[PDB]
Amino acid sequence: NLKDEVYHILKVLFLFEFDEQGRELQKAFEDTLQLMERSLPEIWTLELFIPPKINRRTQWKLSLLD
Amino acid sequence: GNWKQALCVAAQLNFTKDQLVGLGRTLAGKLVEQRKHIDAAMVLEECAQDYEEAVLLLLEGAAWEEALRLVYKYNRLDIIETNVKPSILEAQKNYMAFLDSQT
Amino acid sequence: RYEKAIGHLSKCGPEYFPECLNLIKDKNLYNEALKLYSPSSQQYQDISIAYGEHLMQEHMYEPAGLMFARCGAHEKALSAFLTCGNWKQALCVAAQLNFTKDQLVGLGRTLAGKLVEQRKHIDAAMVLEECAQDYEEAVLLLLEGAAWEEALRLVYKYNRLDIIETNVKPSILEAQKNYMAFLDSQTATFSRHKKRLLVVRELKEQAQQAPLEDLALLEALSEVVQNTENLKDEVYHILKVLFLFEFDEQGRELQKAFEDTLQLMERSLPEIWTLLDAELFIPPKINRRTQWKLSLLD
d(CA C121, CA A20): 37
- Is C69 an 8 Å CB contact of chain A? yes
Cβ–Cβ gap C70/A11 under 8 Å: no
**3 state SS for B4-68:** HHHHHHHHHCCCCCCHHHHHHHHHHHHHHHCCCHHHHHHHHHHHHCCHHHHHHHHHHCCCCHHHH
| d(CA C153, nearest CA chain B) in Å | 5
- Is B88 an 8 Å CB contact of chain A? yes
Q: Which residue of B has its CA nearest to C153?
A: B8
Given a contact cutoff of 8 angstroms between Cβ atoms, the answer to whether C52 and C64 are in contact is yes
Given a contact cutoff of 8 angstroms between Cβ atoms, the answer to whether B19 and B43 are in contact is no
Cβ–Cβ gap B103/A35 under 8 Å: yes
Write the residues followed by a gap in chain C (C–N more than 2.5 A).
210, 275
| d(CA A8, nearest CA chain B) in Å | 8
Residues of C in contact with A14 (CB under 8 A): 66
Residues of B in contact with C89 (CB under 8 A): 65, 69
CB half-sphere exposure, A27, CA atoms < 13 A: 8
d(CA C134, CA C45): 40
Q: Of C228, C141, C126, give the one whose Cα is nearest residue C186.
A: C228
Torsion angles phi and psi, residue C243, rounded to 5: -65, -40
Cβ–Cβ gap B8/C149 under 8 Å: yes
Cβ–Cβ gap B12/C153 under 8 Å: no
Nearest to C69 among A15, A53, A63 (CB): A15
DSSP-derived secondary structure letter, C15: G
Resolution for the entry shown, Å: 2.9
- Is C283 an 8 Å CB contact of chain A? no
Mutate to test the interface with B, among A10, A12, A13, A30 (most CBs of B within 10 A): A12
d(CA C86, CA C89): 6
What is the amino acid identity at position C219?
Answer: E
Compute CA distances B71 → B58, B80, C37, C59, C129, whole Å.
Answer: 11, 8, 32, 29, 18
d(CA C239, CA C237): 5
| d(CA A21, nearest CA chain B) in Å | 8
| d(CA A66, nearest CA chain C) in Å | 9
Please calculate the CA angle C23-C29-C32 and round it to the nearest 5 degrees.
Answer: 120
Within 8 A by CB and 6+ apart from A2, the residues are: A29, A60, B95, B98, B99, B102
DSSP H helices in C58-99: 61-71, 74-83, 87-96
Contacting chains of C (3 CB pairs or more, <8 Å) are: A, B
3-state secondary structure of C172: helix
Residues of C in contact with B4 (CB under 8 A): 149-150, 153
Nearest to B62 among A5, A21, A29 (CB): A5
